[PDB]
């Protein structure tokens, strides 16, 4: 198969006669196909944060486990997300949503989460203070589909309820292999933080995981079933 062509079926998977393995690839037999010299490997890293979220209870959906797409609260009327800390902000765009890093001087004084559709009212690294409308929801605002919220934290002052969260998401990145390279780790495998992925000529071209991730093989030079 020519460059750019990706194999639909995953590595080490049963393939029926005639079944497509790619746009122009048509299997001629029943067996298990294997990737040969994958020309690209996409690794999605895992990133965790304990964010603080503040939303009025009147509209809040009370849920311990928020999965991707799980609808986060309601927000009857558009609600300003009020700052509980003064310092230097920051904006981490999380897919549909965002994240605020509030830091006095260097270290952070707190961690903040913005659900999908809850928009940032402050520039990254901008001068801000407490009691300040950091974000705003227009209502609705479900959890992002690339991120899971484990381990909810329940606390309430009355009207606007403050819940801390345990956030686990992913940040995918691609690595295009070269002829001087060869895949080491197998397809679909849990990968240690900071480990060799694809062995190369010089140790430089060698792929070294930036964080605890997962490995995925894509668009190999060729594939064959046996």
């Amino acid at each position: 198969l020519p460059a750019g062509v990706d194999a639909l079926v995953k590595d080490g998977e049963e393939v029926v006669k005639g079944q497509e393995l790619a746009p122009g690839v048509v299997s001629r037999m029943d067996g298990v196909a294997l990737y040969r010299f994958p020309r690209r490997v996409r690794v999605d890293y895992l990133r965790k944060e304990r964010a603080a979220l503040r939303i009025p209870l009147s509209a809040w959906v009370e849920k311990e486990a928020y999965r991707p797409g799980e609808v986060l609260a309601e927000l009857s009327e558009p609600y300003l997300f009020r700052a509980e800390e003064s310092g230097v902000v920051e904006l981490k765009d999380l897919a549909e949503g965002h994240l605020i890093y509030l830091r006095q001087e260097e270290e952070v004084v707190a961690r903040y989460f913005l659900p999908a559709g809850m928009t940032p009212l402050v520039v990254e690294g901008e001068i801000v203070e407490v009691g300040q409308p950091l974000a705003e929801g227009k209502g609705l605002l479900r959890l992002p589909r690339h991120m899971t919220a484990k381990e909810v934290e329940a606390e309430e002052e009355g009207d606007s309820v403050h819940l801390t969260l345990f956030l686990e998401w992913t940040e995918p990145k691609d690595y295009k292999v070269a002829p001087h390279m060869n895949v080491i780790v197998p397809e679909g495998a849990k990968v240690q933080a900071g480990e060799k992925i694809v062995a190369a000529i010089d140790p430089e071209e060698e792929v070294i995981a930036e964080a605890e991730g997962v490995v995925h093989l894509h668009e190999p030079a060729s594939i064959l079933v046996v």
């Binding site: 002829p179 060869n182 062995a199």
Partner: protein, 114 residues
Amino acid sequence: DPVRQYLHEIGQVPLLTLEEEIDLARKVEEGMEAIKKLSEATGLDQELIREVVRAKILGTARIQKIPGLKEKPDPKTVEEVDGKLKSLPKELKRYLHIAREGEAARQHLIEANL
């Protein structure tokens, strides 16, 4: 016909581009160093277990059975080397396959450049 013979035999197996080539050479060297690695496992010379790979690879009974009336027979000077390193943990038993695949890849690259 012997003339056409070899030509049609090698014309059966294709060539190798940079990808396959570099890979194959890497496989071979990995098998070699794997042998040197296992050369300290039981204390066997890097050349010894090296040919011991041949016993199950490019023929079973045909590599050592007739290099003359005497050589390194399968039961005597071979079998005690085949079932010796045969009991070693993961960190050893893996280099076995590294040497298997390296040894095969050698012959492969050869056939490719034939």
